[PDB]
Design a binder for these strands. Structure first.
Lengths: 297, 297
RNA sequence: CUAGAACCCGCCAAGCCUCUCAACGAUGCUCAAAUGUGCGGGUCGUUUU
RNA sequence: CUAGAACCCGCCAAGCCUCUCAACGAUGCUCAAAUGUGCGGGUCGUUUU
């Protein structure tokens, strides 16, 4: 394997280099300040759509500006916040629904603590390590007063669901043995069991993309969502590409229409796409005429 | 220790219970739907300010409504998003500043990989476990093409800083041996070294509070920030309580005024506080007349 | 966890009439009700602005 | 990592004139420049709407 031949290039020589590659740059102090504080190689992933089609030569396509790179960066920054604000509601609702339906159909407050209610002890006794690792470090308002006051080993499920991560909760959900309980929890969110599990793991990954500031708008996905056969709500008609960012917005909208019927996620999406209108929608995977579908009315 | 005497109470039954505690409830189907989807014990932390001062009796203070509980919940939900949107800029800028000043003052692209540049190997060889654990699982666009193409063990710092968490980066920063480098990085953000380290750990904790949906607005903090003696910018004059949510906003504003001089964080904060005006500001730790300070002009 | 806790297609052990059938339980269903975390096979290489 | 990678106060090994001093290096500084991840001591119990 080849030794790496490139040195560190200073933020002044980077503007000299970028102007040698054909990128038009104006108000050069601002571009040097962005290259110092945001960085070259972070912005390189947004400069990449403006390279000309033999991209191995690293020359830009003509008539391009650095303000277009700032345009794409600020659009992706606003898009991740728009997705996160609506993920938060589902991330509360699934937790509450699991706790409530488990305590209703089991008849115990403490059902999350017993291995007899879960399918495989090989994952249950693994998850108990994460539960003990969170309760071994938590010092919050209600945890320590509970374990001062009360005898039993772990708090009942409405207490314990506040301090667990969402990737723990959706891993507890898949292990629930009595399938009538899983049917009831999936039936509250208007789906059968297997597409509900698939859309939970899509929601978890879409949250992970928003928390760690990854490139979102023209990113190829790889974990394909499942298509339900039985429905209790509005859905897509026109054929769409599954692995772009559009399908995740459709899944979040489908859960949101059951959680909050009077919601306004569409008007957020229109305000975002109209306000940053210089971006081609076909890279984001919306098919043309997406306003016509029953999910988005 | 006492055995726990409370059963699961059905979401129908809590409305009769809450109405027996004196809380006025109207449009009852909505309140049952919120108790099913958001949950009682999550909302209990926002019902708690409306309990009357002998709170051990669990009776509400008179003239209270459940819409006030929804008011406090929606304010805290909007406040965490307002804090996160401004934390993201600093979370990029500190990474870029560390990579750029290290590559400038060391003269190597690969300075993050060598133990001779860090103080204690007892933390460096610990952090190398996290670096290897991220590169052992990453499959992103640029990582795998680099390790196919090039010989050397880890990518240079502008590549590697994209895939590391912020708690890793601020733990790399404290270990840098040559103190002139630390002075240069702190001097770019207009502070001396020790309050810069203190404000980095306050920024990391304030991000952690926003990502996991914790109660924020009337929460007591415990990790007290440091007060700088040497300054290169505007700061507070009037004496303020350190351990409320106000001081974190002041630190984020101080970094933001150096990153982006034309920023608009006050226009976010005043619109938030005026739009949800039924909430007492003294619980949030703003002293009266906070508009008068040089930091907020 | 965005080559995965991914998607698809057949086969199996049990069971039942929501669908559909000349059959009245299979020519049906397993994403109705119920229920197992059964098995083999196959595609997917991470930015056209 | 919101009883901590927290804050505060003294003491030590080295060093230097940015401050300040009758001293021209201590009556100074260690959050100027430089530099060590040195030491002992002390407070902080996690929602008045």
């Amino acid at each position: 394997r080849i030794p790496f031949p490139k040195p560190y290039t200073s933020a002044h020589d980077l503007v000299s280099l970028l102007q040698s590659r054909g990128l038009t740059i104006a108000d050069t102090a601002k571009t040097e300040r962005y290259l110092e504080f945001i960085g070259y190689y972070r912005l390189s992933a947004y400069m990449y759509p403006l390279l000309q089609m033999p991209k191995e030569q690293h020359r830009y396509k003509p008539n391009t500006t650095f303000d277009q790179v700032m345009m794409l960066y600020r659009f992706d920054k606003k898009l991740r916040l728009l997705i996160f604000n609506e993920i938060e509601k589902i991330e509360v609702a699934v937790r509450s629904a699991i706790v409530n339906i488990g305590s209703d159909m089991i008849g115990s407050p403490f059902w999350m603590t017993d291995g007899s209610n879960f399918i495989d002890p090989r994952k249950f006794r693994h998850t108990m390590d994460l539960i003990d690792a969170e309760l071994g470090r938590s010092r919050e308002d209600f945890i320590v007063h509970f374990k001062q006051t009360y005898s039993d080993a772990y708090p009942p499920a409405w207490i314990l669901a506040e301090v667990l991560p969402f990737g723990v909760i959706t891993n507890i959900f898949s292990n629930i043995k009595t399938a009538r309980i899983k049917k009831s929890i999936a039936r509250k969110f208007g789906l059968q069991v297997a597409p509900f599990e698939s859309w939970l793991t899509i929601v978890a990954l879409t949250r992970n993309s928003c928390c760690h500031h990854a490139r979102v708008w023209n990113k190829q996905n790889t974990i394909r969502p499942m298509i339900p056969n039985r429905m209790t709500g509005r859905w897509i008609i026109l054929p769409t590409d599954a692995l772009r960012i559009y399908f995740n917005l459709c899944i979040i909208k489908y859960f949101l229409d059951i959680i909050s019927p009077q919601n306004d996620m569409k008007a957020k999406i229109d305000a975002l796409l109209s306000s940053y209108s210089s971006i081609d929608i076909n890279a984001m995977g919306f098919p043309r005429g997406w306003e016509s579908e029953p999910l988005w009315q």
